[PDB]
Amino acid sequence: DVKLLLLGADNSGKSTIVKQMIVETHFTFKNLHFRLFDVGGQRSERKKWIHCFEDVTAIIFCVDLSDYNRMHESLMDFDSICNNKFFIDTSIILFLNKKDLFGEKIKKSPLTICFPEYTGPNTYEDAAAYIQAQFESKNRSPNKEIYCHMTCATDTNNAQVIFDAVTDIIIANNLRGCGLY
Amino acid sequence: CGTEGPNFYVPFSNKTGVVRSPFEAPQYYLAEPWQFSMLAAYMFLLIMLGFPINFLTLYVTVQHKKLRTPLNYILLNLAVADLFMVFGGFTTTLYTSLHGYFVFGPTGCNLEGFFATLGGEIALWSLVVLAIERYVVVCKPMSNFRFGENHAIMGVAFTWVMALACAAPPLVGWSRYIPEGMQCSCGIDYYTPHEETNNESFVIYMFVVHFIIPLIVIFFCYGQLVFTVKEAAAQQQESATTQKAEKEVTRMVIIYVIAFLICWLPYAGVAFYIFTHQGSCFGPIFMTIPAFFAKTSAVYNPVIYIMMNKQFRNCM
């Protein structure tokens, strides 16, 4: 079965993903059963579980696009997991949630508030791309693979995103085991 | 055309009285002694390439216990296979080609032909099994599988089963081991008739079970594997490692197929044209063309499937 770690923020939206039926969910698809673990990853709440997860297929990391306060918290939490000695090779599925709340947030709240160096015009297509770039900037791991997706707050169906990413991860690993690539 | 013998067949007419036994006279009337000088030296070359690579594979697995996984067993098998070809084949051939004629007697002829052929067949079916393993693992056809050490053992065992199904019958009366080509090296009699040992039925059995079936399986399995990787790459256009894997896997599959055609389509074509073109006659120079292509696989199947394999380049 597939082990999926589910990280992010209290107000990031993983609270809704986990409900599609260490807190374990047993959702399944395509004769493939997933074990989804909602855990924390802050720092203080990270030594409580990191030492007993091994053979984690992927790490689902959630980000509230409209939340500038937790943004750098999430950037550094991300960096410290993506570059973490236990998950240096565990591929990541990155949801940037509340896409539309961000589409309205950016109209009345410039992105410069939390990225002062941002020089682009505050439009959804550029600000969201800049945020995505900032998370992937911290990758620092040659062949890691970060599967990105921007989710329409609750108004979408993004379990398929997870499973396509997981299958891609799996085939890459099976080739690795055979000695091909 | 040739001098028919019981334990042997020398492709050279005795109407002149010149021909002798391949267990007897230096065969310098098949080819000038310079050719057998090169012959013996070439066997030492392949000893000093084959045993380095093939033993080191075994040694490395011992040294690094990270490599002891089920998927690599059949490559270890491959290494083992080619070491028969080094000792059963190349070493005992060395002590005969140095003379010009086969020294260790017809019992040494059976020993050489058997152990050489046993190694060659183990390698052949190791590659068939390797393709089957990769097919099941990556394409996930059964889709209710795990693949453990039990399955890897069955895969290795099956190569010994099939290898014996080819190498042992000439020891009991289905074809015969005789000096072929320049008569310093003994192998299967695929090129003469012999009703006492039923050569025709053995050659047809060989061509279908030990060539056509292995080739069909290898093409099919690697074809499905490439299709699967291509399909995955098609869906994840933005997944860099899958695009990389697509390209790399396809490079390797083409290499694999060409290696197997170079290795076996010589014997296949030679034996088939002997079979359908009975009005023909070949001498040592051409009867060692297929032996050439097959024997050198003791080096470059270990290269192609072990050295290039990405779990052993990291030990280098």
Ligand SMILES: *C/C=C(C)/C=C/C=C(C)/C=C/C1=C(C)CCCC1(C)C
């Ligand atoms: C140095 C020589 C060795 C190990 C020679 C081995 C020869 C064979 C295993 C040949 C096998 C075949 C035939 C006799 C006829 C059809 C084609 C083959 C390769 C299956």
Ligand SMILES: *[C@@H]1O[C@H](CO)[C@@H](O)[C@H](O)[C@H]1NC(C)=O
């Ligand atoms: C062929 O003739 C040579 C000439 O002496 C002889 O030594 C050899 O035994 C003969 N072999 C056969 C099969 O007639």
